[PDB]
Subunit: 275 residues, 6 copies
Amino acid sequence: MDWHIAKHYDDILYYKAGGIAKIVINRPHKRNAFRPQTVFELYDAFCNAREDNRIGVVLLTGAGPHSDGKYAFCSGGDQSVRGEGGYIDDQGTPRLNVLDLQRLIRSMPKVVIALVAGYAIGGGHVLHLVCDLTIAADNAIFGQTGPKVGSFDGGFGSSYLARIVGQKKAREIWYLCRQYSAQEAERMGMVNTVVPVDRLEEEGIQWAKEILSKSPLAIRCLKAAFNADCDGQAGLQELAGNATLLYYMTEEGSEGKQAFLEKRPPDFSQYPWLP
Amino acid sequence: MDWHIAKHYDDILYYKAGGIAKIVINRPHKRNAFRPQTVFELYDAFCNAREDNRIGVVLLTGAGPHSDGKYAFCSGGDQSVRGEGGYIDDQGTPRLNVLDLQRLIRSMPKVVIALVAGYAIGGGHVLHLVCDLTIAADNAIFGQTGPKVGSFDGGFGSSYLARIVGQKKAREIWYLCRQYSAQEAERMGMVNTVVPVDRLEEEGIQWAKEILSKSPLAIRCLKAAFNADCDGQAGLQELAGNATLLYYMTEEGSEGKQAFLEKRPPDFSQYPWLP
Amino acid sequence: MDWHIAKHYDDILYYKAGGIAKIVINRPHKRNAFRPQTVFELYDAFCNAREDNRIGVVLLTGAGPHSDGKYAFCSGGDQSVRGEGGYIDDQGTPRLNVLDLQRLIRSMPKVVIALVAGYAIGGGHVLHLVCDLTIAADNAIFGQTGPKVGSFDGGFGSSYLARIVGQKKAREIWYLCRQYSAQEAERMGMVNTVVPVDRLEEEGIQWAKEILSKSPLAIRCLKAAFNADCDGQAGLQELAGNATLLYYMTEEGSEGKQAFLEKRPPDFSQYPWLP
Amino acid sequence: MDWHIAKHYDDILYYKAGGIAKIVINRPHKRNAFRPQTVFELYDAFCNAREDNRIGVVLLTGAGPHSDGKYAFCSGGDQSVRGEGGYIDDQGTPRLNVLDLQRLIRSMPKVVIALVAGYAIGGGHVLHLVCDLTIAADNAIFGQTGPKVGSFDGGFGSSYLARIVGQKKAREIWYLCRQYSAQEAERMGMVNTVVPVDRLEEEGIQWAKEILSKSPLAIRCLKAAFNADCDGQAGLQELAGNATLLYYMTEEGSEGKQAFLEKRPPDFSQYPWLP
Amino acid sequence: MDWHIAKHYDDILYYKAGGIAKIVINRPHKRNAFRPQTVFELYDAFCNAREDNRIGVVLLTGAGPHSDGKYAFCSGGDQSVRGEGGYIDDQGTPRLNVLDLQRLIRSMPKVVIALVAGYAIGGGHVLHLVCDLTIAADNAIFGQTGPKVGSFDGGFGSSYLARIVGQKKAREIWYLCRQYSAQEAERMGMVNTVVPVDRLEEEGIQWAKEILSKSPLAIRCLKAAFNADCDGQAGLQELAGNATLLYYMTEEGSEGKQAFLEKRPPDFSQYPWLP
Amino acid sequence: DWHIAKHYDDILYYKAGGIAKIVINRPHKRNAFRPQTVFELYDAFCNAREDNRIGVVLLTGAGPHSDGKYAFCSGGDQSVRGEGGYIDDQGTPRLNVLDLQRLIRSMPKVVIALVAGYAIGGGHVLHLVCDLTIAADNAIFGQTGPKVGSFDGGFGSSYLARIVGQKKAREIWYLCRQYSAQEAERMGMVNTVVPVDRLEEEGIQWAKEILSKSPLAIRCLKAAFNADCDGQAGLQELAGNATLLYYMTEEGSEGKQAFLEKRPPDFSQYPWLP
Ligand SMILES: CC(C)(COP(=O)(O)OP(=O)(O)OC[C@H]1O[C@@H](n2cnc3c(N)ncnc32)[C@H](O)[C@@H]1OP(=O)(O)O)[C@@H](O)C(=O)NCCC(=O)NCCSC(=O)c1ccccc1O
Ligand SMILES: CC(C)(COP(=O)(O)OP(=O)(O)OC[C@H]1O[C@@H](n2cnc3c(N)ncnc32)[C@H](O)[C@@H]1OP(=O)(O)O)[C@@H](O)C(=O)NCCC(=O)NCCSC(=O)c1ccccc1O
Ligand SMILES: CC(C)(COP(=O)(O)OP(=O)(O)OC[C@H]1O[C@@H](n2cnc3c(N)ncnc32)[C@H](O)[C@@H]1OP(=O)(O)O)[C@@H](O)C(=O)NCCC(=O)NCCSC(=O)c1ccccc1O
Ligand SMILES: CC(C)(COP(=O)(O)OP(=O)(O)OC[C@H]1O[C@@H](n2cnc3c(N)ncnc32)[C@H](O)[C@@H]1OP(=O)(O)O)[C@@H](O)C(=O)NCCC(=O)NCCSC(=O)c1ccccc1O
Ligand SMILES: CC(C)(COP(=O)(O)OP(=O)(O)OC[C@H]1O[C@@H](n2cnc3c(N)ncnc32)[C@H](O)[C@@H]1OP(=O)(O)O)[C@@H](O)C(=O)NCCC(=O)NCCSC(=O)c1ccccc1O
Ligand SMILES: CC(C)(COP(=O)(O)OP(=O)(O)OC[C@H]1O[C@@H](n2cnc3c(N)ncnc32)[C@H](O)[C@@H]1OP(=O)(O)O)[C@@H](O)C(=O)NCCC(=O)NCCSC(=O)c1ccccc1O
């Protein structure tokens, strides 16, 4: 693929090619753990993808292999900056801003695919989970660590995981903090497919292209519909929001607008009350 | 208004005029209690209204006053035909088919307004509740009777009532089986407005007309949206269904249709992936 | 089995034998796509099955093989009659009446089993999904096509699917519009069992008989309970409706009815307030 | 009424009369604040009432007036024994056992009526909220104090309050920590009725007697149904639990039991599959 | 108050004083309708407020009176820039970005109070609703207009409104598109208090100061708890996120961090498994 | 090294380190529970909950029986089933297993079902509501309600669906078939499968991996999982844990001290974080 750099960052790499964006967490010396700046940059990059009318799919992955030969998607919050009440940014502010990133990935009307090679651990595991889809390399390793390292994600990390692998397996994952292979992760329902490491990016590109040939309006409505099964009124906001969008493409709707601007009463008399 | 009979029934009366249909429960010797046939006919009448592209609003009310001077919207299930496991129809089958009627009124994409003069009691009270709106006459009397007469409605009768008057008041209504005035009913939030008896139908017509001047598409989407706060996936079905409806009016959607019929790949390349 | 024709239709075939009904979509020249009339007839047949006190289980399947040797359960909405805002009926009205069929299948207190040979695609796929159970032949092929053909089902097609195969696999199914084999469908959780094509009906009959040897009241309560995990207040309506049904079979409840009819205060004094 | 002491406690008083139980919080020197012992005892008394087949209604109230002439329902958690992580019991164990009491009151199949004279503040306010009904004396004063005293009830204290007074008023109550009169509390929807201080107990008894003349089975099903609008699967458990109870009173149900005991196949062939 | 300008914008004004921020929509020639830029700026200012450790409360209001003597909070989407599929920004992109602003106001851990003088109509009405609290001047006018002007808000505008005024009144508001006085709005439950126009800001400041003397941790937890009753897993994310925040302030939690950094197994053996 | 912790008629109850073991001991009825069995089970689980050293509870059945067969639990004892419920010795109809279900589900300790042989009917639902399930390869799972004139439309239905999905959950209940340990794992309702003589050791092994974790983290997580299912009751548990943690902060303590000292609280130093 001919990837073009789209913007420069300190902790990540960001590329575009056709309708695909690629976001790479680039802190291999920390197994691609995120510090607050990493989350800020990830958020910025995902926002850019959201605003780009040409991009329909974002591939999210980690830099590797590292000098020690190991692969990693993301090892979660950088523990070396963890202080009282959160992860300390350069101004001394404790933060949990990955929560904001989680929501953006979840709600943006573009499909996000996690491409996992090596470790997807802790907060890194939850990031893989909230991505729409996950493609794993056969060397991928999945797991949570919260109860061992003094943390937990009781939001999407728990409930949404249960909506993927079911309640028994979700609890096992969090309580024991074991590691799971790519094959185990696929069998339990949380990984869509598994390929060799050297095929991981091309598979992502293949899946991305099958989506890029579909109707953008259809895709965004379906993504909202899936969220609507989880996120109550916030889910309804996204789903109803797309209904409003589509309604704003109708003549019936436009008559309401035109009537207001022309200071006359609207005339919906020709329009039927359908069953 | 020039109401014209639209179809003949044994237990009810059914009229249409302009964009309004009027359905009248007609068993005043039973304070308008419904027997299984009454529910069958009500259901049929609402279906007819649903199918008529000219009808946007349905007024539901009870026949009166009766020979005793009393008014009644509906007194619920006819206890005189109640047998083992439900209300016995003319074929000997026990039924709780008012549940089907509740669902039809609740889901049909037309506004239904209960016009309550006199008693709306028991199953008759639940009917008023599931109508979109309620306009009451000053002589209206509301209440549940289940725990006194060996019944209960633990479906929309309970949960949906709580979404109207709040949990404290809903529990009071059901546990004590007291009666409530039109003013008390409005104050608690379950009656939209109150007018003198002789003004009841005309108020109904005025409210119907204010809705009939609105966009049918906007109205149906809103009704689905309101149901969506209550009915989980069934509510999602109605709201997403309207999104599908609207999407079927877009050129983007039509390309998908035409491509299939012409046995060619669709080309959505021109359409943007909006924010 | 000695199937007996139960009623004649244009687009479907309808049989009964013992406690089993069999409904067959009969438009093999369109891979059994449904037009509005097809849905009307399916709805009528399911209502009949619902009304028949002898029928406990309904088998739903597609006519085949076709003259080209191919099998199909259902290929979804007939694209050849699709117009603005829906599928255009013979009177010129745009419809999405499959939504009503979905609700009927989902809520009727009889077990519905989809018998899928060959294609269950698009709206045909959602139909299989909303059936209680699915038995597949080895030649079955499952998938959604919405984003490719300019449609989507963001109701039961999305949310309820996620409650079967989990969020990751449900999104994949819709975003990519691939086809899935029977073994794949079974592994992901949406097909209950797989058998050879010529053993499909006999498998359906056997499963039906195992249900028919059970308590009808127990089965209906369970079906409502499953819906209740999905359909919010609509689900409560079904579950509470069954509690009412059962309560109408009690002596305690009848004392309430009798008291009213005999115009005396009820006497529940003998009855305990159990823990 | 002739109240009889039913069991002796240190921190509360417990009486019975006919089908009514009365539980009185008795620490007037602390405006009836609860310490862990108080909660243990309250739980015990409510359990007793639950196990007593003669008791249908429980009245909950505070001892008063105090020597200063002041009335109090309950001032919440006893701050004088609050320590690290909770309220410290006599063994040094930090506890939040009022959460267990909230659940018992909420789920027990008997109606609980809070009789509030004077202060219902903090955890004392939440206690009034979770009781089925609330009757207030003219001198009643309601409010939350968490954000002022370094606490919060983000459980039934927040969500369930919103289901009573609506989201705007519920947020106001908690954010500002003001006090509300009986009239204000009634108008907002969280108090069922208001009576003079010296009529409070008689009003409680009158409401209780109106409940005690109803069907105990109807009442328990209704209470479960109301919970089911709030408590997801736990609510389904209560409601389905009652359906099971009712089914266990049927001959159809008994056929299953007998068949098992007699080591024979059950015969449900005579029973219909109702609509 | 000595308000200080905090940042310069085109469509709005932004001030700070003590723990209070004030955001003023400043397009009085359009009754304070928002165009995409207005939303962009509102979003930025609310983000600024969120990031300011000194700000606990945000007052949101409209500029007025206008040259015509009229007051307005906000009249919703600027119809003069509405085009196909949304509101057209300065780059030609159709947007519904008020949806993003809604989520920010709803989720940010500071109390937002709408100060409504004059019109809060359509999208402007939904903005007032999603603020935590609303204080109205006695000249305030509330209402929705969607079905008249060819729009609807089927997200928070519908469901969340029902959680404030109940289902009956919410439907009325949307279906008829009438106007409601401050008094009617308070009576129905969606306005917290009403004061004279000349007292509106001082009342806002008064309420803000009562919140500013409270515990910030308590307030954020409560706000998340209220959202959790509406927003399913998204609500859980906020509520669990705060639990994580608090857990990150515990010694027990830090031991997990330290063990990881020091490359040793954690020792939680000293910590109890509390009831 | 198990130590008897309390004596019961229908069950056995032990502790060792941070693990409690509760054993249903009515093998002559395939460990069916009568109201007393449930009362004792509730009592034992309450004990475990109240025991500050206990972090994990293993639940299992006595076996093998004299007929060589294993059983976790065969559900409600049909031999005492009467009108409206299971008749206790004072003549009262009961459904008190529902109370046990809630206790197991809500207690801030991990409960692991160790299933050898039959987990059937109400016994099957008990395994389901336990946090985790470890099965021996001879384990057999299933529901029987519609066959024996009962049903569990609460956690037995909805919660099962949140484990195996709607299609499989309905199959299980409608047909009342039996499922192997391997089948149970493949569908998602069993965490792992081992040989029968390795069953207890696997449970102990799993318990220990949990006992080395943070008790606060584990309780918050269990509540968080319940919250995806139990609406406001789930919120009560989750928010309750937030309150617990807030009661460990200085900020929170200022509010208490201020009240006790009859002075206005001073939270002025504390930030309004993002
Ligand atoms: C990822 C894993 C399993 C890999 O193990 P291994 O291959 O053995 O690598 P190693 O552990 O040796 O790590 C290599 C270097 O990267 C650092 N490193 C790795 N992960 C790090 C991290 N998360 N923070 C800081 N440094 C890290 C290491 O400390 C080490 O650095 P040096 O000693 O060479 O200097 C293994 O490394 C591992 O278990 N990492 C920890 C993962 C973890 O526990 N994450 C959860 C923290 S909580 C969280 O993510 C979170 C944050 C916000 C909101 C919610 C949340 O749940
Ligand atoms: C409605 C009410 C309060 C009116 O009282 P009142 O003005 O004193 O009239 P009265 O009680 O004298 O009744 C007049 C005649 O109509 C009959 N009548 C009135 N309502 C009836 C009914 N529901 N069934 C059969 N006959 C009825 C009466 O029996 C009486 O007949 P006669 O003595 O002249 O022969 C007062 O009449 C009253 O309280 N009726 C009871 C209403 C009630 O308790 N409904 C609960 C049944 S449960 C239900 O609605 C339901 C059904 C299916 C599914 C779910 C459900 O919740
Ligand atoms: C089913 C499938 C995959 C089979 O492929 P194939 O075996 O190759 O058959 P072929 O494509 O040649 O089709 C055979 C004939 O049946 C027609 N045909 C098949 N399906 C049709 C349909 N759904 N409508 C009209 N004509 C159809 C075809 O046009 C063709 O006719 P002729 O050339 O001989 O004239 C393959 O045929 C296929 O993919 N069909 C379309 C499936 C599809 O995209 N369905 C969903 C549309 S949206 C939906 O159902 C829906 C409905 C309600 C609510 C929400 C919704 O999303
Ligand atoms: C209740 C109220 C408003 C009454 O005011 P007032 O009439 O003026 O009485 P006063 O404040 O003087 O109190 C009288 C005496 O009772 C004690 N007292 C009153 N309430 C107490 C309490 N809750 N704990 C310990 N001692 C108490 C006082 O400290 C005082 O004792 P002495 O000086 O004579 O020694 C006014 O007293 C008041 O606001 N009290 C505090 C109420 C409060 O803030 N409760 C919340 C605690 S957090 C919570 O309840 C909670 C706990 C567990 C779970 C969830 C929860 O939400
Ligand atoms: C607010 C209201 C009721 C006041 O009426 P009035 O006092 O009589 O003022 P007037 O109607 O004359 O309007 C004054 C000027 O401001 C403009 N103006 C007022 N509102 C405007 C608006 N929303 N957009 C553009 N220009 C506006 C007017 O066009 C007029 O301009 P000029 O003629 O002098 O040039 C009355 O003005 C009124 O009803 N306005 C429209 C309210 C409305 O229908 N809002 C809904 C739009 S849909 C939406 O908000 C939305 C957007 C995104 C997502 C969800 C959503 O619901
Ligand atoms: C478990 C199972 C499949 C074992 O089969 P098998 O190995 O062949 O043993 P067998 O059937 O011979 O039973 C052995 C003895 O234990 C008794 N026994 C076994 N289970 C019993 C039980 N549950 N109650 C009373 N006695 C029992 C039997 O009657 C038999 O006794 P004797 O002949 O020696 O006298 C097989 O035994 C079996 O299917 N048992 C019945 C399981 C069942 O249907 N449970 C459903 C009750 S519903 C419930 O649990 C419930 C409770 C509360 C709320 C909701 C609910 O759904």
